[PDB]
Design a protein around this ligand. Structure first.
Ligand SMILES: [Zn+2]
Lengths: 207, 100, 187, 72, 186
RNA sequence: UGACUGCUCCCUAGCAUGCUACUACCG
RNA sequence: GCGGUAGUAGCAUGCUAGGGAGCAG
C-alpha cells in the first residue's frame, strides 16, 4: 500500500525488468534477472547462472518468452496516439487490423417474415448485429487504460475486509497438484506471443 | 429463465462464415437455439411465443426438405427416424423439469 | 482365424463325425460325435477367442508408440526453430554503446525500458494528425531522448511515400492519417 | 421497410469488403462509419439517405458490373 | 429381407418343424426339430441385424460426405452469391432515390466521389453522350439522387473547361464528351 | 489475428455393469 | 432333474476418450 504512493514520485523509465549481459557458450545475451514493481519493491532472481555451455529445453523456453531479448533488440518507438508509456517496436511497418461485418442468412429471413414477424410496430425488433470497426480500433481501444490511476486504499479497514472475505471462501479446499493431474479442455488454443508462430498449446503440452 | 427475443432472433439471422448460413448442413444450431428459446412459450405477451413456434417449424422445414433433396440425387434416403422428436415441444420441455 | 493349433484336432474330429454320418452306425456313434464335437469346439472356445484379444492389444500398443514417435520428432523441430531465432536475433544487439552502458552500472542491472531509449539506432514515431505533427517531427530534424534525430522517410496508412513538402494545412485532409515517420540517430 | 434496410446495408458492406475497399484506409473508414450509423438508426429516412450514399461508394467502380447484373 | 442364404436355411427349418408339429409325431423328431431350428434361427437373427446396422451406417456416411461437398462449394462461390443476393434485395427494396441512381449508373452518370448529403458540399458525375445528359441536364440544375444539384463547372476529357451554352445536339458533336459536370446541393 | 472458465445438446469409439437368449460342458 | 461355468448374439446403464455446435461473464 505505501509503496503504491511513494512510487509515483520517481520516474517511470526505471520500472520493469532488470537485465544483465550473461555469456552462454562464450556468447553474450541479455536476460531478465529481477523486477522492480511499483508495489513490491525490488525482487532479485535466485538461480542466475553467469555462464553455460548449453541451454536445455526449459531454458530455451524461459528465454524466448521474455521481453528482454525482443525489446533490447528493436527500433525505438514514440506513440503519439496514446498516453500509455510505449517501449519498443519489432517490425518496420506498423499493422492496422480491422473487423468485418456479419453474414446475412436470407432464407431464415424470408421464412421469418412469412409468419408475420417484423411488422413495423411489433414488440420484437432486430437489435443485436455484427458491428464493424475500421483500422486503428485495436489501439484506440487499448488506450482506455488511461482510466486506471494509482490508488492508495485505506488500510486499517482493508485489513478487516480481508478477514471477512476469507471467511466467505472458507468451506472450500485446495493445494498444489502435480503435473499429471491437471485437466485442460480444448487443447488447440493459441499460445501467445513468442510461441504462436509454431503451433497451438498442444505442441508445447507434448514436447 | 428466458432470454431476450431480439437476441435469439438476431442470432438466428446473422452468422459468421458462409457455411453457418446454409442451414441444412447445420441443423445442430437451431436445436440449441430452440432449447434456449423455450421458456418464452409460457410467456404472457404474444409475439414471444411465436418465436418458439417459428423455430420449431423451421427445423421441420429444414429436415423434411433435406431428406427428399438427398433422396433424389441418391436413389433413397431417410428410413429410420425418431428425429420427429426435434420438432415437437415434449423434447425441449424435459430440460426445465428437475430430473437428471 | 483359419490356421490355429487346435484347428487340426477340430478338423479330424468332425471329418470323422461326418465319416460316421457317412456310415451311420450306432447311437454310441452319436455319443462319440457329440462328445468329440463339443470338446473340439471347447478348444476354439479358447484359441480363436483369446488370440483375437491378443491382436487387439498388440496393434493397439503399436499405434500408441507410433503416436509417441511423432510427438518426439515435433520436440526436435520446435527446439531447432527457437534456437535459430535466438541466434539470429542476437546479432543485431548493437554490441557497442550497449557494452558501454552496461559496464558502467552498479552491477549489470539496468532497467529494460532504457536499453532501446539510449542505444537503439532508429526511431519510429506515429502521428495522428497535422496539428500534433508540427509540435514534434517538423522539418528534417527533431530531438527526442536528447539525441539528435533526422527524418529520412515518411509513409502513412496504406504504406506509401510522401515527400515532406506535402504536409501543410491545405494538403492535409488528403493524407491517410496516421503518418509514420522513420528517423535515424544522428550524432 | 426498416429491418429490410438494415439487412440490405449489411450485405452491402460485405460485398464492398470483398472488392478490397478495405485497403484504401479513409475509404474504408467512411464506409464503416455509415454502416454503423444505419444499424442504429431509429427513424427511417436517415437510413435511406445514408444508404444511397453508401451505395455510391460501390457504383463508382467497374467491378459490380451493373448492366448485366440487372438482367431482370 | 429374404436375400441372404441364412434366410433360406431358417426358412426350411421353420418349414419342416411346422410340418411336423402340424402332422404330429413322436418327441424325437421335434427335439431334432428344435436343434435343427434354433441353431438356424441363431445363424439368422444375428447377421440379419448386423446387416441392418451396416446399411444404416452406409447411409449416414454418404450423407456426411454430401454435407462436406456442399460446403466446399458454398464457401467457394461467395463472390457471386453476395452480389446477386444484393441486387434482388435492392429491386425488392425500391426507391426513386435508389432506382434513379441505379438506372443512371446502368447508363453513364456514375459518380466519382461519395454522394454527399450536406446542403453545401459538392459532387461529380461522368456524363457521356448528349442524351442522358439532356434528359438530366437543363440550364443550371442537375437533378439526381432525387436531389437538385445546381451546376458550378463543366469540363471534358483532357479538361478544357468548355461553357455550357455551347452544348446542343449538333454543335456538341465537337467536344470531348466525358464531362465531369460538378455541382452543389440544392 | 482466434484468451481463461463454466453449463448444455448431437454423432461416432472404447470399457464396465447389468439385462438378455441360444448353444455348450460338469455335478 | 437343478445348478455350474464357458463361448455367442441382443438391450440398458455408467465411464472414458476424440468430433461438431450453442449460450453466459
Ligand atoms: Zn503450493
Amino acid at each position: 500500500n505505501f509503496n503504491v504512493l511513494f512510487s509515483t514520485v520517481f520516474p517511470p523509465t526505471s520500472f520493469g525488468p532488470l537485465v544483465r549481459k550473461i555469456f552462454v557458450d562464450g556468447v553474450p545475451f541479455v536476460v531478465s534477472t529481477g523486477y522492480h514493481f511499483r508495489e513490491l519493491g525490488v525482487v532479485h532472481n535466485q538461480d542466475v547462472n553467469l555462464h553455460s555451455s548449453r541451454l536445455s529445453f526449459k531454458e530455451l523456453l524461459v528465454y524466448a518468452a521474455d521481453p528482454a531479448m525482443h525489446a533490447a533488440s528493436g527500433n525505438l518507438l514514440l506513440d503519439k496516439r496514446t498516453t500509455c508509456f510505449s517501449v519498443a517496436a519489432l517490425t518496420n511497418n506498423v499493422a492496422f487490423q480491422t473487423v468485418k461485418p456479419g453474414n446475412f442468412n436470407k432464407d431464415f429471413y424470408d421464412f421469418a417474415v412469412s409468419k408475420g414477424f417484423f411488422k413495423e410496430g411489433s414488440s420484437v425488433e432486430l437489435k443485436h448485429f455484427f458491428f464493424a470497426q475500421d483500422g486503428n480500433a485495436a489501439i484506440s481501444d487499448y488506450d482506455y487504460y488511461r482510466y486506471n490511476l494509482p490508488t492508495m486504499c485505506d488500510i486499517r479497514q482493508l485489513l478487516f475486509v480481508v478477514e471477512v472475505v476469507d471467511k466467505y471462501f472458507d468451506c472450500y479446499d485446495g493445494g498444489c497438484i502435480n503435473a499429471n493431474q491437471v485437466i485442460v479442455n480444448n487443447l488447440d488454443k493459441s499460445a501467445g506471443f513468442p510461441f504462436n508462430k509454431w503451433g497451438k498449446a498442444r505442441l508445447y503440452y507434448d514436447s | 429463465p428466458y432470454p431476450d427475443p431480439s437476441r435469439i432472433l438476431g442470432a438466428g439471422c446473422f452468422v459468421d462464415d458462409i457455411v453457418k448460413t446454409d442451414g441444412t448442413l447445420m441443423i445442430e444450431r437451431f436445436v440449441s437455439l430452440a432449447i434456449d428459446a423455450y421458456p418464452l412459450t409460457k410467456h404472457p405477451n404474444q409475439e414471444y411465443a411465436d418465436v418458439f413456434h417459428l423455430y420449431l417449424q423451421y427445423i421441420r422445414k429444414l429436415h423434411d426438405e433435406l431428406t427428399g433433396h438427398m433422396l433424389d440425387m441418391y436413389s433413397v434416403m431417410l428410413t429410420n427416424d425418431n428425429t420427429s422428436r426435434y420438432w415437437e415441444p415434449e423434447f425441449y420441455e424435459a430440460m426445465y423439469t428437475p430430473h437428471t | 482365424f483359419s490356421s490355429l493349433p487346435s484347428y487340426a484336432a477340430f478338423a479330424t474330429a468332425q471329418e470323422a463325425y461326418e465319416q460316421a454320418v457317412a456310415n451311420g452306425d450306432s447311437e454310441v456313434v452319436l455319443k462319440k460325435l457329440k462328445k468329440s464335437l463339443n470338446v473340439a469346439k471347447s478348444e476354439f472356445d479358447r484359441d480363436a477367442a483369446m488370440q483375437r484379444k491378443l491382436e487387439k492389444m498388440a496393434d493397439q500398443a503399436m499405434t500408441q508408440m507410433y503416436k509417441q514417435a511423432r510427438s518426439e520428432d515435433k520436440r526436435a523441430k520446435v527446439t531447432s526453430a527457437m534456437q535459430t531465432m535466438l541466434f539470429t536475433m542476437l546479432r543485431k544487439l548493437d554490441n557497442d554503446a550497449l557494452n558501454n552502458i552496461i559496464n558502467n552500472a552498479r552491477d549489470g542491472c539496468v532497467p529494460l525500458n532504457i536499453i532501446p531509449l539510449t542505444t537503439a539506432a532508429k526511431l519510429m514515431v506515429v502521428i495522428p494528425d497535422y496539428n500534433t505533427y508540427k509540435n514534434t517531427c517538423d522539418g528534417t530534424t527533431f530531438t527526442y531522448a536528447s539525441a539528435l534525430w533526422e527524418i529520412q522517410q515518411v509513409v502513412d496508412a496504406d504504406s506509401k511515400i510522401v515527400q515532406l513538402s506535402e504536409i501543410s494545412m491545405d494538403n492535409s485532409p488528403n493524407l491517410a492519417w496516421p503518418l509514420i515517420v522513420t528517423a535515424l540517430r544522428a550524432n | 421497410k426498416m429491418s429490410d434496410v438494415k439487412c440490405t446495408s449489411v450485405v452491402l458492406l460485405s460485398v464492398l469488403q470483398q472488392l478490397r475497399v478495405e485497403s484504401s484506409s479513409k475509404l474504408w473508414a467512411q464506409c464503416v462509419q455509415l454502416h454503423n450509423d444505419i444499424l442504429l438508426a431509429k427513424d427511417t429516412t436517415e437510413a435511406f439517405e445514408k444508404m444511397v450514399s453508401l451505395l455510391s461508394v460501390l457504383l463508382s467502380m467497374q467491378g459490380a458490373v451493373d448492366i448485366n447484373k440487372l438482367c431482370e
